[PDB]
């Protein structure tokens, strides 16, 4: 039984999709995968320290930066400790441990075991880490902030308790019987044929078509298409890709070799995906669950089992020329056969791996074997330092082989929870490229999620995000998610439960409000009024008393501050919500401010924000800080999600509107005035000016490399302390935004120089040449971003932007100049591109 199912109904409302359902399946791959993950799960559930799991200490092993050592002028750090409005300050060494620090306290007070939680967060300072390595601590230092801690007792591991569990040499050929659609598109008489590709990691190996026929709602061919590929030549994870043209309207896929290593036999009636108008949605083994409206195709398979010399000088240089080449530079036939003939020489350079493994004729049995023999002698790979860029490329859509991919996942095992979180989003998106539902990478995510509540928490939302918004992959992900929830342990099952209730109630309210204000620039009296009452109505006897904040799980949100909630003034009508801090030990009475928005796809934003963090940590490796401000954002459902409200901030546009705010007259001098009146001292002003030169610069480089640099004033923001930040990534040109008003804060005006500009240029160019040290990583991330998170993208030119941006294949000198010019374009255009948004109101 009875409470195996109530549970299962619980798991289904948390997941947001029913995995036990089998209405959309033509084999048993998902259920097998549900069976398959019990053990990896139970393994990690069995092997985890109950205590440390309950306290999820957030820790890093990275060096403390130069800029944060400069924040410690005494080899000594302050830490206020409280019990019940009684508290003392302790002078502590950066290398002191929480345990050790508890020795130095027990003396001071009194003349059994407790723990150091952070005042106002479900965060802890525990475990054998020197405090200098707890993330909360580094964050306090960076922002000029006092470390406040309360002395309470551990959380009880019982609360995590997991519920106990209860469970031939023939050429290949394929019979096209035909297609069926209840209702035809456009309606005139065009032309229709079927295309049947045998694919492997986007390599097309062989291809046959049918004779075309007129597009009638039922078309019949009854033809064998004989490929030349031999059955024995077919490689695991090969896809029979079936497509319809009249041109490309529909596609569906079928794994020729199933999760048991059996050739696929029998009749099939696949409901096909319809195009819109390259992209990860094109790869899915899933069929369209919409049986009533979708085009469908009918087929038959009936075809069983299966599971040196010294290299000369001037070719070495061609080989090396190739290996050095970036991830997006294409390989020639010539290239590919070079790599292959010298596969053993290539095997020594881990950088060569992606290129080498795409010089493999995967449609030849013998070659694969030699390739598997090649993988056997994996000494140099196993031993190399972990390179994420390189690891990630082997997980992209170019690699379908399970053992190539698995060595990449081998290298990720050595990542610490700190780095998993950096790449988690991108690793979840890369499940989309796995031929099978059960994969080394899917198990890795599972395993790293269960090991650590912070990874588990984000794993839940990231996966739920995709389940709710993609039919192409909701089945797969729903299976991985189910597997997570069965090991995460009852505390969390209750946490997630609270969270789902909240963000479903609030989405109702978000959408009901959009209804009332048609568009009409003004947000009405009646409008805000109805907001309040709905919120009053929800708080009254339904909403959870409290809940974790999805984009920062340390924070527990209390009641809604109904007075402060409102509707924002966009064409979309996002909610502005503020909640009380549910933690009574909180250092403040400062509300938690969340924004709910429907209208842009928030997955794009998540992805962009996450590259931003990556770019921040890349800057940590050269002791740089550009004070980026990647606010929280969790994509929750269909074109909808939540956003972190940054406190004490306004729009550039609005600082322009204050003094002028005309129809578009922009003034050079206002930004600097705004800061002064929002700086009490004149010291804190120059700090704002400082913060701004870094934040401006950071956002100039980042935004440019990503090609999201021509933005409007309104979608750029500044905090009252100089911290600048772009928002709204969902949504004559300019490379980036360095307007005359930014420039005026840098003591400069329409072609001259000055100290703070000399600084700005110094940082940009450094920031720039740095990111280029990580070219391959960024290229891989961006290219993955597009394929898994955008519309349809040109599998050359949309993607090929960034490599021209990072000015690939260039000496440092050139590239610095290249950037400097870009600044000079924004100096030439001044306000002109800014100006131009409006003017087109009628264009
Ligand atoms: C005080 C205040 O209004 N702060 C704000 N912070 C943010 C951060 C992000 C976004 C945002 C909104 C939509 C899409 N993307 C980001 C809006 C605000 S308002």
CA of 704 to the centre of ligand 1 (A): 21
840 is in an annotated binding site: no
* Backbone φ/ψ region at 639: left (φ over 0), alpha (ψ -120 to 50), beta: left
| 77-82 and 147-152 beta bridge pairing | parallel
Q: What is the dihedral of CA 466, 468, 474, 479, to 10 degrees?
A: 90
Mutate to test the pocket of ligand 1, among 594, 636, 645, 725 (most ligand atoms within 8 A of CB): 645
Cα(50)–Cα(441) distance, integer angstroms: 25
Sheet of strand 147-152: strand arrangement: 87-92, 77-82, 147-152, 115-118, 124-125
Q: Are 596 and 510 in contact (CB under 8 A)?
A: yes
CA of 647 to the centre of ligand 1 (A): 9
Nearest CA to ligand 1 atom 8: 645
Mutate to test the pocket of ligand 1, among 551, 567, 646 (most ligand atoms within 8 A of CB): 646
602 is in an annotated binding site: yes
CA of 751 to the centre of ligand 1 (A): 33
Cα(16)–Cα(712) distance, integer angstroms: 37
Q: Are 745 and 672 in contact (CB under 8 A)?
A: yes
CA of 631 to the centre of ligand 1 (A): 8
Nearest CA to ligand 1 atom 9: 727
Task: From the CA of 647, give the closest atom in ligand 1.
Answer: 1
CA of 727 to the centre of ligand 1 (A): 7
What resolution (Å)?
A: 2.7
Structure tokens at 620: 């940590």
Q: Are 123 and 137 in contact (CB under 8 A)?
A: no
Structure tokens at 170: 């023939």
DSSP string, 713-742: GGGEEEETTS-EEE--TT----SS---HHH
If you search the block for the tokens 């006897």, which residue do you land on? 541
Give the contacts of 494 (CB within 8 A, at least 6 positions apart). none
Cα(406)–Cα(390) distance, integer angstroms: 13
Residues with beta carbon inside 6 Å of ligand 1?
Answer: 595, 597, 631, 643, 645-646, 649, 727-728
Q: Please report how many Cα atoms fall inside a 13 Å half-sphere around the Cα of residue 579, on the Cβ side.
A: 23
Cα(566)–Cα(649) distance, integer angstroms: 17
Nearest CA to ligand 1 atom 18: 645
Closest by CA to 747, choosing from 736, 759, 732, 737, is 759
598 is in an annotated binding site: yes
Question: HEC string of 685-702?
Answer: HHHHHHHHHHHHHHHHHH
Q: Which domains does the chain have, with CATH numbers?
A: 1-165 (3.10.20.90), 168-303 (2.60.40.150), 304-489 (1.25.40.70), 490-647 (3.30.1010.10), 648-835 (1.10.1070.11)
Mutate to test the pocket of ligand 1, among 643, 695, 725 (most ligand atoms within 8 A of CB): 643
Task: From the CA of 568, give the closest atom in ligand 1.
Answer: 19
Cα(391)–Cα(381) distance, integer angstroms: 11
CA of 644 to the centre of ligand 1 (A): 7
Cα(625)–Cα(694) distance, integer angstroms: 8
CA of 651 to the centre of ligand 1 (A): 9
612 is in an annotated binding site: no
Q: Angle CA(415)–CA(421)–CA(424) in degrees, nearest 5?
A: 90
CA of 714 to the centre of ligand 1 (A): 11
CA of 748 to the centre of ligand 1 (A): 29
Mutate to test the pocket of ligand 1, among 695, 716, 727 (most ligand atoms within 8 A of CB): 727
Cα(353)–Cα(528) distance, integer angstroms: 58
629 is in an annotated binding site: yes
CA of 728 to the centre of ligand 1 (A): 8
698 is in an annotated binding site: no
> φ, ψ for residue 329 (rounded to 5)?
-65, 120
H-helix or E-strand spanning residue 89:
strand 87-92
Nearest CA to ligand 1 atom 10: 727
Give the contacts of 592 (CB within 8 A, at least 6 positions apart). 549, 555, 557, 578, 579, 580, 581
728 is in an annotated binding site: yes
Mutate to test the pocket of ligand 1, among 510, 647, 649, 695 (most ligand atoms within 8 A of CB): 649
Nearest CA to ligand 1 atom 13: 728
Nearest CA to ligand 1 atom 7: 645
CA of 587 to the centre of ligand 1 (A): 24
- Alpha-carbon distances of 229 from 205, 401, 402, rounded to whole Å: 8, 18, 21
Closest by CA to 729, choosing from 749, 684, 699, is 699
148 is in an annotated binding site: no
- DSSP category for residue 450: H
729 is in an annotated binding site: yes
341 is in an annotated binding site: no
Q: Are 580 and 559 in contact (CB under 8 A)?
A: yes
449 is in an annotated binding site: no
- What are the counts of helices (DSSP H) followed by strands (DSSP E) for the chain? 31, 25
Nearest CA to ligand 1 atom 19: 645
Structure tokens at 464: 């739920």
Give the contacts of 136 (CB within 8 A, at least 6 positions apart). 58, 118, 121, 123, 125, 147
Task: From the CA of 600, give the closest atom in ligand 1.
Answer: 14
CA of 652 to the centre of ligand 1 (A): 12
Give the contacts of 198 (CB within 8 A, at least 6 positions apart). 172, 204, 205, 206, 207, 227, 229, 234, 238, 239, 240, 241, 256, 363
CA of 536 to the centre of ligand 1 (A): 24
Nearest CA to ligand 1 atom 12: 728
Give the contacts of 448 (CB within 8 A, at least 6 positions apart). 417, 420, 455, 459
> φ, ψ for residue 371 (rounded to 5)?
-65, -35
């Amino acid at each position: 039984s009875e409470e195996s199912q109530a549970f299962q109904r619980q798991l289904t409302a948390l997941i947001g999709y029913d995995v036990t359902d089998v209405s959309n399946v033509h084999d048993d791959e998902l259920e097998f995968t549900r069976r398959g993950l019990v053990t990896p799960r139970m393994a990690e559930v069995a092997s985890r320290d109950p205590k440390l799991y309950a306290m999820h200490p957030w820790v890093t092993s990275k060096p403390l930066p130069e800029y944060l050592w400069k924040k410690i002028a005494n080899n000594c750090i302050f830490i206020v400790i409280h019990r019940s409005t009684t508290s003392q300050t302790i002078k502590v060494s950066p290398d002191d441990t929480p345990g050790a620090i508890l020795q130095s306290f027990f003396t001071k007070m009194a003349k059994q075991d407790f723990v150091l939680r952070v005042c106002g967060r479900d965060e802890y300072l525990v475990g054998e880490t020197p405090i200098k390595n707890f993330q909360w601590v580094r964050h306090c230092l960076k922002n000029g902030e006092e470390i406040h801690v309360v002395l309470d007792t551990p959380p009880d591991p019982a609360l995590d308790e997991v519920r106990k569990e209860e469970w031939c040499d023939r050429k290949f050929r394929v019979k096209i019987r035909g297609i069926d659609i209840p209702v035809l598109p456009r309606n005139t008489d065009l032309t229709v044929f079927v295309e049947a590709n045998i694919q492997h990691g986007q390599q097309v190996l062989c291809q046959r078509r049918t004779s075309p026929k007129p597009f009638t709602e039922e078309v019949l061919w009854n033809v064998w298409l004989e490929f030349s590929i031999k059955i024995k030549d077919l490689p695991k994870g090969a896809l029979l890709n079936l497509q319809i043209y009249c041109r490309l309207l529909y596609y569906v896929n079928l794994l020729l070799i199933d999760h048991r290593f059996l050739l696929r036999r029998g009749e099939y009636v696949l409901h096909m995906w319809q195009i819109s108008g390259f992209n990860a949605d094109k790869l899915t083994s899933a069929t369209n669950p919409d049986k009533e409206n979708s085009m469908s195709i009918s087929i038959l398979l009936d075809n069983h089992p299966i599971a040196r010399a010294e290299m000369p000088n001037q070719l070495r240089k061609q080989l090396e020329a190739i290996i050095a080449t970036d991830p997006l530079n294409p390989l020639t036939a010539e290239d590919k056969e070079l790599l292959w003939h010298f596969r053993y020489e290539s095997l020594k350079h881990p950088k060569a791996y992606p290129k080498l493994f795409s010089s493999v004729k995967w449609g030849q049995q013998e070659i694969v074997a030699k390739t598997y023999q090649l993988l056997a002698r994996r000494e140099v790979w196993d031993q190399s330092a972990l390179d994420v860029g390189l690891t990630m490329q082997l997980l992209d859509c170019n690699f379908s082989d399970e053992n190539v991919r698995a060595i990449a996942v081998q290298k990720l095992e050595s990542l610490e929870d700190d780095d998993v979180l950096h790449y988690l989003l991108q690793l979840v998106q890369a499940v989309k490229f796995e031929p099978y539902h059960d994969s080394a990478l899917a198990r890795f995510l599972l395993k790293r999620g269960l090991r650590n509540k912070r990874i588990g928490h984000f794993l839940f939302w990231f996966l739920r995000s995709e389940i709710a918004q993609s039919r192409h992959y909701q089945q797969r992900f729903a299976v991985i998610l189910e597997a997570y929830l069965r090991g995460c342990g009852t505390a969390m099952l209750h946490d997630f439960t609270q969270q789902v209730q909240v963000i479903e109630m609030l989405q109702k309210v978000t959408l009901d409000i959009k209804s009332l204000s048609a568009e009409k620039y003004d947000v009405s009296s009646q409008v805000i009024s109805q907001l309040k009452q709905k919120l009053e109505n929800l708080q009254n006897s339904q909403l959870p008393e409290s809940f974790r904040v999805p984009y920062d799980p340390g924070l527990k949100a209390g009641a809604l501050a109904i007075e402060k909630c409102k509707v924002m003034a966009s064409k979309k009508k996002p909610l502005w919500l503020e909640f009380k801090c549910a933690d009574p030990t909180a250092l403040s009475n400062e509300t938690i401010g969340i924004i709910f928005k429907h209208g842009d796809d928030l997955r794009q934003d998540m992805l962009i924000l996450q590259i931003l963090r990556i770019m921040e940590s890349i800057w940590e490796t050269e002791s740089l800080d550009l004070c980026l401000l990647p606010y929280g954002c969790i994509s929750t459902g269909d074109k909808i999600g939540m956003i972190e409200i940054v406190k004490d901030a306004t729009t550039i546009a609005k600082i322009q509107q204050s003094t002028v705010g005309n129809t578009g007259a922009f003034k050079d001098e206002v930004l600097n005035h705004w800061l002064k009146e929002k700086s009490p001292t004149e010291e804190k002003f120059q700090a704002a000016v400082e913060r701004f030169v870094y934040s401006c610069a950071g956002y100039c480089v980042a935004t440019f490399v990503l090609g999201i640099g021509d933005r409007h004033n309104d979608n750029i923001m500044i905090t009252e302390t100089g911290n600048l930040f772009h928002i709204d990534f969902g949504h004559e040109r300019v490379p980036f935004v360095l307007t005359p008003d930014f420039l005026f804060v840098m003591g400069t005006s329409g072609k001259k120089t000055s100290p703070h500009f000399q600084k700005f240029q110094d940082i940009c160019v450094k920031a720039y040449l740095a990111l280029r040290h990580h070219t391959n990583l960024l290229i891989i991330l961006f290219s993955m971003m597009l394929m898994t998170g955008m519309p349809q993208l040109t599998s050359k030119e949309d993607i090929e932007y960034i490599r021209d941006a990072l000015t690939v294949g260039k000496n440092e000198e050139d590239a610095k100049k290249y950037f400097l010019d870009q600044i000079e374009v924004c100096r030439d255009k001044g306000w002109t591109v800014q100006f131009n948004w409006f003017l087109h109101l009628v264009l």
